[PDB]
């Protein structure tokens, strides 16, 4: 049949993101949020419904996160909240959420390598679970009196346990797979009840099981479901996996668990879980292979999948075979027939959920005997438009088909003793101050260069009056957002109108769509960094992003290695980096805000890709000079497991976080490392609304003298200050410039 894993709950104008917002500020009840919620469920239930899908989720949808809906049903609030007991309502869940006037939010942490965030829960000895939330079985019945039956979704117990964190004092030795007794129970509670109301599959969303597990924690699942099992008799249960493939002991863990009846497997991102399945697959056990993919934009190739389909229905076929997404339909965009300016020959290459839910269908059906050949035709021209179509492949794959001159170390002259050659190009006083590169919006409007050029001069001659502030910087008022007003320059990409994502809470993103070789076409930064170093006496730092960040957040085209593509972006970043030298540009500063954001989940895969990463973002800047500085920024303070990279980066001067962590442990950077070159960690947190007096900056800036040495240390920011007002950056920098000419008098 057909199935589709978790489907996104924004609405396709997001409605739920404004009807959320409207409910936070109080401008709406709860009784409109509610009326919001139920229309939407409805609406995605009957529409997967129509589309002749077998296995129609229940419980994905959720009011912000899907971890937090586990942890209400546990009843697993945090002391802090004052909860009390009973069904959890509105109140407390967003409490939890997103905190309240007096007692902080619940951290929120990255869900896998995806681009969502989920809110970690605070586990230890003292907590009471209860069964507080009948959001599940209520959505069942809901949706069982609309006249669709669904199979409920919940985030298998042994995942949740392994995805929480021990709340504050729970000593060390606490290991928090010792709360499966406490949590099991109520886990049976929700699935006779579940039953009761006439269910007959139910989803345990098990992905963890896809990450390298030690055999101590694999056995943790097998007793759990077994501790199950009775409960789950007389019910047919699928325990689903995706990101990933699924390791071999991980496997036989895996399709050996009591109770369970099928398995989902991620076939797009782990087809190397296919292996296993033809070794040795259990009985008449269903498979859910999940070829669609559900983490990208593009059209599906009813041709390839159909071919695995078929070979899997070998393995079993007997009817037991269920075609499926590979994940969550939540990390991609809802309707692809909102997009009215793309053109139609790029659509054509492109499906986002709806799309994708029929996609599922089709194939289905094609298993059945009953290929709807209108659909397939239609797939397979638009695949072959894609693989001729000179808007794809260009001779940008010749210049790439050079950049495998080994390595492109930035020409030899050690970088210690390049150091000098620029400070004689520059010449500044020890412990120089400068900022990240953004500074606070005003007005805002959509001739107008002269506009531009007026809220700049206002960041310059504030910079030189703002105590001194060595190195200076435009504010990209020119720049909407970091990743998208490059790709807006570049060839291999293109926009969306209505393609987004939920990221977290109620907040999205739109991610640019690279669909084929990228190529910088004309000078891009250039003109506003080369008219802002003239405002001024002082170093204009040029901006730019790193190519690792602009692929980490795009929709990558599927038809290459993520690497090839990176690589050609970083030849095309490569040239302004070139042009912005000639134009006079002594000091280029290049962010790397998402390095570690495609880190891949398997352990023995990471060396591969912080070396192309890194890599990219050497054929950055390999050919600039040896007076021309180059600085790199990444949104991050702990290293300890990726420091070599960011050494190999090979960069005069880096800006990461800290500003809220020990100075002590920027002795990751000397200890059998011995960095020596440009580093600055953060002295003034921009993700608070309030100052630092320039005696707590003065403070820091010592104790990292102490550790990180004194002769190449930089006095910077936490990040840009684009959320920040100017009213609360206005005196905290004044602060860090005090703060280090007190420390320069000594
Ligand atoms: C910078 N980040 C962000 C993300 N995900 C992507 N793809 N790209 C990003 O810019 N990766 C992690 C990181 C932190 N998370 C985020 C995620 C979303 C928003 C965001 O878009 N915030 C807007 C809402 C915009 C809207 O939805 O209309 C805000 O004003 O809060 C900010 C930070
Ligand atoms: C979040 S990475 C920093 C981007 C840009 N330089 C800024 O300061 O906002
Ligand atoms: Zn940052
Ligand atoms: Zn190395």
Same mark, same amino acid.
């Given at each position: 049949?057909?199935?589709?894993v978790?489907y996104?709950?924004?609405?396709?104008?997001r409605?739920?993101?404004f009807?959320?917002?409207?409910?936070?500020?109080?401008?709406?009840?709860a009784e409109?949020?509610?009326?919001?919620?139920?229309?939407?469920?409805?609406?995605?239930?009957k529409?997967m419904?129509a589309?002749? $899908?077998?296995?129609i989720?229940?419980? $994905?949808?959720?009011?912000?996160?899907?971890?937090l809906?586990?942890t209400?049903?546990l009843?697993?609030?945090?002391?802090?909240?004052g909860y009390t007991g009973?069904?959890?309502?509105?109140?407390?869940?967003?409490?939890?959420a997103?905190?309240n006037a007096?007692?902080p939010?619940?951290?929120?942490?990255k869900?896998?390598?995806?681009?969502?965030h989920?809110?970690?829960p605070?586990?230890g000895?003292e907590?009471?679970?209860?069964?507080?939330?009948?959001?599940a079985?209520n959505?069942?019945?809901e949706?069982?009196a609309?006249?669709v039956? $669904?199979?409920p979704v919940?985030?298998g117990?042994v995942?949740?346990?392994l995805?929480?964190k021990?709340?504050?004092?729970?000593?060390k030795?606490?290991?928090?797979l010792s709360l499966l007794?406490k949590?099991?129970?109520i886990y049976?509670?929700?699935?006779?009840?579940?039953?009761?109301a006439?269910?007959?599959?139910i989803?345990?969303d098990?992905p963890?099981?896809?990450?390298?597990?030690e055999?101590?924690?694999?056995?943790?699942?097998?007793g759990?479901?077994?501790?199950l099992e009775?409960?789950?008799?007389?019910?047919?249960?699928?325990?689903?996996?995706?990101?990933?493939?699924?390791?071999?002991?991980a496997?036989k863990?895996?399709t050996?668990?009591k109770?369970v009846?099928?398995?989902?497997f991620?076939?797009?991102?782990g087809?190397?879980?296919?292996?296993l399945?033809?070794?040795?697959?259990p009985e008449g056990?269903?498979?859910?292979?999940?070829v669609?993919?559900?983490?990208?934009?593009?059209?599906?190739?009813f041709?390839?999948?159909?071919?695995?389909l078929?070979?899997?229905?070998?393995i079993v076929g007997?009817?037991?075979?269920?075609v499926?997404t590979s994940?969550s339909?939540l990390?991609?965009?809802?309707?692809?027939?909102?997009?009215?300016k793309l053109d139609?020959?790029?659509?054509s290459?492109?499906?986002?959920?709806?799309?994708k839910?029929?996609?599922?269908?089709?194939?289905?059906?094609?298993?059945?005997?009953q290929?709807?050949?209108?659909?397939?035709?239609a797939n397979?021209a638009?695949?072959?438009?894609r693989?001729?179509?000179?808007?794809?492949?260009?001779e940008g794959?010749?210049?790439?088909?050079?950049?495998?001159?080994?390595?492109?170390?930035?020409?030899?002259?050690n970088?210690?003793?390049?150091?000098?050659?620029?400070?004689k190009?520059?010449n500044?006083?020890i412990l120089?101050?400068?900022t990240?590169?953004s500074f606070?919006?005003?007005?805002?409007?959509?001739?107008?260069?002269?506009k531009?050029?007026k809220?700049?001069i206002?960041?310059?001659?504030?910079l030189?009056?703002?105590?001194?502030?060595?190195?200076?910087?435009?504010?990209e008022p020119?720049?909407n957002?970091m990743v998208?007003?490059?790709?807006?320059?570049?060839s291999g990409?293109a926009?969306?109108?209505?393609?987004?994502?939920?990221?977290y809470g109620?907040r999205?993103?739109?991610?640019?769509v690279?669909?084929?070789?990228?190529s910088?076409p004309?000078?891009?930064?250039?003109?506003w960094?080369?008219?802002?170093?003239?405002?001024?006496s002082?170093?204009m730092?040029?901006?730019?992003?790193?190519?690792?960040?602009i692929?980490?957040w795009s929709?990558?085209?599927?038809?290459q290695?993520?690497?090839?593509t990176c690589?050609?972006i970083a030849?095309?970043?490569?040239?302004?980096?070139?042009?912005?030298?000639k134009?006079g540009?002594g000091v280029?500063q290049?962010?790397?805000?998402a390095?570690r954001?495609?880190?891949?989940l398997?352990?023995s895969?990471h060396?591969?890709?912080?070396d192309?990463?890194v890599h990219?973002?050497?054929?950055?800047?390999?050919?600039?000079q040896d007076? $021309?500085?180059?600085?790199?920024?990444?949104?991050?303070?702990?290293f300890?497991?990726?420091?070599?990279?960011?050494?190999?980066?090979?960069?005069?001067?880096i800006t990461?976080?800290?500003s809220?962590?020990?100075e002590?442990?920027?002795?990751?950077?000397?200890?059998?490392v011995?960095?020596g070159?440009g580093?600055?960690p953060?002295?003034?947190?921009?993700?608070?609304?309030?100052?630092?007096?320039?005696e707590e900056?003065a403070?820091?800036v010592?104790?990292?003298?102490?550790?990180?040495?004194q002769?190449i240390?930089?006095?910077?920011?936490?990040?840009?200050?684009?959320?920040?007002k100017?009213?609360?950056?206005?005196?905290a920098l004044?602060?860090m410039?005090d703060?280090?000419?007190?420390i320069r008098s000594?």
């Amino acid at each position: 049949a057909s199935h589709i894993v978790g489907y996104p709950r924004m609405g396709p104008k997001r409605e739920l993101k404004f009807a959320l917002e409207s409910f936070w500020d109080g401008k709406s009840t709860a009784e409109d949020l509610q009326k919001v919620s139920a229309d939407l469920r409805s609406s995605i239930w009957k529409q997967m419904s129509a589309a002749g $899908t077998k296995f129609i989720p229940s419980n $994905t949808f959720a009011h912000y996160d899907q971890v937090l809906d586990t942890t209400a049903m546990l009843g697993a609030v945090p002391p802090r909240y004052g909860y009390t007991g009973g069904e959890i309502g509105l109140d407390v869940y967003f409490s939890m959420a997103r905190g309240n006037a007096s007692v902080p939010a619940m951290e929120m942490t990255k869900w896998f390598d995806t681009n969502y965030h989920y809110i970690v829960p605070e586990l230890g000895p003292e907590v009471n679970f209860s069964y507080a939330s009948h959001k599940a079985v209520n959505e069942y019945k809901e949706a069982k009196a609309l006249g669709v039956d $669904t199979v409920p979704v919940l985030v298998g117990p042994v995942s949740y346990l392994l995805l929480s964190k021990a709340a504050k004092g729970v000593d060390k030795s606490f290991e928090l797979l010792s709360l499966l007794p406490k949590i099991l129970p109520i886990y049976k509670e929700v699935i006779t009840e579940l039953k009761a109301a006439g269910a007959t599959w139910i989803q345990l969303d098990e992905p963890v099981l896809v990450m390298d597990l030690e055999g101590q924690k694999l056995q943790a699942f097998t007793g759990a479901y077994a501790e199950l099992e009775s409960t789950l008799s007389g019910l047919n249960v699928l325990v689903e996996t995706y990101f990933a493939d699924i390791p071999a002991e991980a496997y036989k863990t895996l399709t050996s668990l009591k109770g369970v009846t099928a398995f989902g497997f991620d076939l797009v991102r782990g087809t190397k879980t296919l292996d296993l399945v033809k070794a040795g697959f259990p009985e008449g056990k269903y498979l859910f292979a999940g070829v669609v993919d559900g983490r990208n934009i593009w059209a599906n190739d009813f041709a390839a999948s159909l071919s695995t389909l078929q070979a899997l229905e070998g393995i079993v076929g007997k009817d037991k075979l269920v075609v499926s997404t590979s994940c969550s339909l939540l990390h991609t965009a809802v309707d692809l027939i909102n997009e009215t300016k793309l053109d139609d020959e790029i659509k054509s290459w492109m499906a986002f959920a709806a799309q994708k839910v029929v996609e599922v269908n089709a194939l289905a059906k094609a298993l059945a005997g009953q290929k709807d050949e209108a659909l397939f035709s239609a797939n397979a021209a638009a695949l072959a438009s894609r693989r001729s179509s000179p808007r794809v492949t260009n001779e940008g794959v010749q210049k790439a088909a050079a950049a495998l001159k080994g390595s492109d170390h930035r020409r030899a002259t050690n970088v210690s003793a390049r150091l000098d050659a620029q400070q004689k190009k520059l010449n500044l006083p020890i412990l120089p101050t400068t900022t990240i590169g953004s500074f606070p919006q005003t007005v805002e409007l959509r001739e107008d260069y002269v506009k531009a050029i007026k809220e700049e001069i206002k960041k310059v001659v504030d910079l030189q009056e703002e105590l001194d502030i060595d190195v200076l910087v435009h504010g990209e008022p020119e720049r909407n957002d970091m990743v998208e007003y490059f790709g807006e320059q570049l060839s291999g990409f293109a926009f969306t109108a209505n393609g987004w994502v939920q990221s977290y809470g109620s907040r999205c993103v739109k991610p640019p769509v690279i669909y084929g070789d990228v190529s910088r076409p004309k000078a891009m930064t250039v003109f506003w960094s080369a008219m802002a170093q003239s405002m001024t006496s002082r170093p204009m730092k040029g901006m730019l992003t790193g190519p690792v960040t602009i692929l980490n957040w795009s929709f990558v085209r599927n038809d290459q290695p993520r690497h090839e593509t990176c690589y050609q972006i970083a030849l095309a970043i490569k040239d302004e980096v070139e042009d912005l030298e000639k134009g006079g540009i002594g000091v280029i500063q290049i962010d790397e805000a998402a390095l570690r954001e495609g880190l891949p989940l398997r352990k023995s895969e990471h060396a591969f890709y912080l070396d192309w990463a890194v890599h990219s973002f050497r054929i950055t800047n390999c050919g600039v000079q040896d007076s $021309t500085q180059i600085h790199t920024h990444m949104c991050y303070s702990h290293f300890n497991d990726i420091i070599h990279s960011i050494i190999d980066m090979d960069a005069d001067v880096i800006t990461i976080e800290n500003s809220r962590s020990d100075e002590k442990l920027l002795s990751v950077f000397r200890e059998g490392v011995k960095y020596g070159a440009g580093i600055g960690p953060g002295v003034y947190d921009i993700h608070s609304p309030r100052i630092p007096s320039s005696e707590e900056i003065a403070d820091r800036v010592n104790k990292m003298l102490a550790v990180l040495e004194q002769n190449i240390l930089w006095v910077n920011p936490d990040c840009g200050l684009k959320t920040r007002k100017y009213t609360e950056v206005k005196p905290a920098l004044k602060n860090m410039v005090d703060a280090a000419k007190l420390i320069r008098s000594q």
